[PDB]
Design a protein around this ligand. Structure first.
Ligand SMILES: O=C(O)CNC(=O)C(=O)O
Ligand code: NI
Ligand SMILES: [Zn+2]
Ligand SMILES: [Zn+2]
Lengths: 7, 487
């Protein structure tokens, strides 16, 4: 949704 | 499978290690601020909590330890440098994953930190065999639970409660007064609500930099050490260049490789390319702090469980700026609304100045906000730069455009972004009669349509006069302070 990065 | 005679442990300078007193520990943001001048040039640092500060981990409840299922992803360590993403791995529990880690280390090594290090980089740099591990990364603590305690009202008083309200509890750090993330209403996952990292041996988090160049705080709850390598922020670009230089084909294939978090490069090569790298060994019960735009990477020495979260003191505001601007040029989507945080900070500070004008009692919060705002203040400088940017951007608009004052609920609910930049438009937006609910930034208002200016308008949240009034208010303009204390 609103988020930090994931590889 | 282990081959110590061919180990490739990179000989890297240590990141500074800090031992805060209880006093220092009572004020997380203040302590981080004192840390800044001493360790910002290192990119990362290791923070050992005062003796006997060891908050209980709720994840160790066997109700969660043995039952709470979490996803993992598969990492081929031998592929991290020389060769793409991580594929879906099997589900695990903490118990299960620890057991498989024990099994793995037993098979692979039949083991201290430098041995594991040398062997890890052995696998990465040189590639005898395929080594395949799992990582339970970026797990939502609102889904899984946090490694820190929470308050339970009906139960007897405990030290657990004190930990739950402690500032270094990562559930509380993001929105401490002094951190502009407090002005983001949404509980953004990862940025504001802490994320969980369950690890096994060789579990990697590849080279990356926090979103919006934020500060990163990482607490290792339990398990084996986590090895970190960090680059100073002021060498970020250099690092990047070296990547482009040392992995040409991977960047020909994926020019956006850096933001993909699947590529690892050895600190040895980095040192031979002139990039300063600093090593840190995070053990159980310890913190690791990452500074703005500080590229960092690292791996796990075995089974562990970490918890990370972003934080944003006022000094971050200049970097957080660059970031979003950079994002605009990269035409990459953001994770938060920067102008919301900046304006929010300015509004809180103005509120405090207004309180002082009423000869209200000076609290620690009021003091902290006053300290960062005046013609020398970091907050004042940030706001000033933003307003200047606004005025130039508006100045560059050709005459025709109409103004409509943006209604406050314009970013609530919906993130609004430049159709081309993905620049967050919390402060300004441009549009035409061609495209309702489709906007551009003030820099790309030109590129929106083909229509003449008759049809062109601009949503403005605050008039230029009001913004400059804000800058003056931070500098002590009492009328301006009165003005912005009303908003
Ligand atoms: O520990 C990990 O797997 C990765 N951690 C981070 O990126 C961090 O704390 O900022
Ligand atoms: Ni990180
Ligand atoms: Zn744009
Ligand atoms: Zn148009």
């Amino acid at each position: 949704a609103r988020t930090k990065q994931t590889a | 499978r282990w081959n110590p005679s061919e180990a490739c442990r990179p000989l890297v300078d240590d990141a500074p290690i800090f031992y805060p007193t209880n006093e220092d520990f009572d004020d997380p943001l203040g302590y981080i601020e004192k840390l800044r001048s001493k360790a910002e040039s290192y990119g990362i640092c290791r923070i050992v909590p005062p003796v006997a500060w060891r908050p209980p981990c709720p994840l160790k409840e066997k109700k969660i330890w043995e039952n709470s299922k979490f996803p993992t992803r598969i990492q081929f360590i031998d592929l991290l440098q020389n060769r793409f993403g991580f594929q879906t791995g099997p589900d695990f529990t903490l118990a299960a994953f620890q057991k498989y880690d024990e099994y793995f280390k037993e098979c692979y090594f039949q083991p201290k930190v430098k041995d594991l290090e040398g062997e890890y980089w052995r696998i990465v740099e040189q590639a005898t065999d395929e080594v395949e591990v799992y990582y339970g990364a970026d797990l939502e603590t609102k889904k899984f639970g946090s490694g820190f305690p929470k308050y339970k009202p009906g139960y007897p008083i405990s030290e657990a409660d004190q930990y739950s309200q402690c500032g270094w509890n990562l559930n509380n750090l993001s929105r401490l007064p002094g951190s502009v993330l407090a002005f983001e209403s949404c509980d953004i996952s990862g940025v504001i609500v802490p994320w969980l990292y369950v690890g096994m041996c060789f579990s990697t988090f590849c080279w990356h930099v926090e979103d919006h160049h934020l500060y990163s705080m990482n607490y290792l709850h339990t398990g084996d050490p986590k090895v970190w390598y960090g680059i100073p922020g002021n060498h970020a670009e250099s690092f990047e260049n070296v990547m482009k230089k040392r992995l040409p084909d991977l960047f020909e294939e994926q020019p956006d490789l850096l933001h993909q978090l699947v590529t690892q490069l050895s600190p040895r090569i980095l040192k031979e390319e002139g990039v300063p790298v600093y090593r840190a060994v995070q053990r159980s019960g310890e913190f690791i702090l990452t500074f703005p735009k500080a590229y960092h990477s690292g791996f796990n020495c075995g089974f562990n469980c970490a918890e990370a979260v972003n934080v944003a003191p006022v000094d971050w505001l200049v970097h957080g700026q660059n970031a979003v601007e950079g994002y605009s040029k990269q035409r990459r989507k953001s994770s938060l609304s920067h102008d919301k945080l900046l304006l929010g900070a300015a509004m809180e500070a103005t509120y405090c100045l207004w309180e002082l004008s009423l000869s209200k009692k000076k609290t620690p919060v009021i003091a902290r906000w006053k300290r960062v705002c005046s013609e020398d203040g970091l907050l004042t400088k940030a706001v000033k730069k933003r307003v200047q940017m606004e005025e130039e951007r508006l100045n560059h608009l050709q005459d025709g455009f109409s103004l409509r004052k943006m209604e406050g609920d314009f970013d609530n609910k919906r993130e609004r972004e430049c159709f081309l930049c993905f620049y967050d438009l919390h402060m300004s937006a441009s549009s035409c009669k061609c495209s309702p609910n489709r906007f551009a930034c003030l820099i790309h208002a030109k590129d929106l349509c083909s229509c003449e200016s008759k049809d062109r308008y601009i949503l403005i949240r605050h008039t230029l006069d009001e913004l400059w009034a804000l800058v003056r208010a931070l500098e002590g303009d009492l009328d301006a302070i009165d003005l912005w204390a009303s908003k």
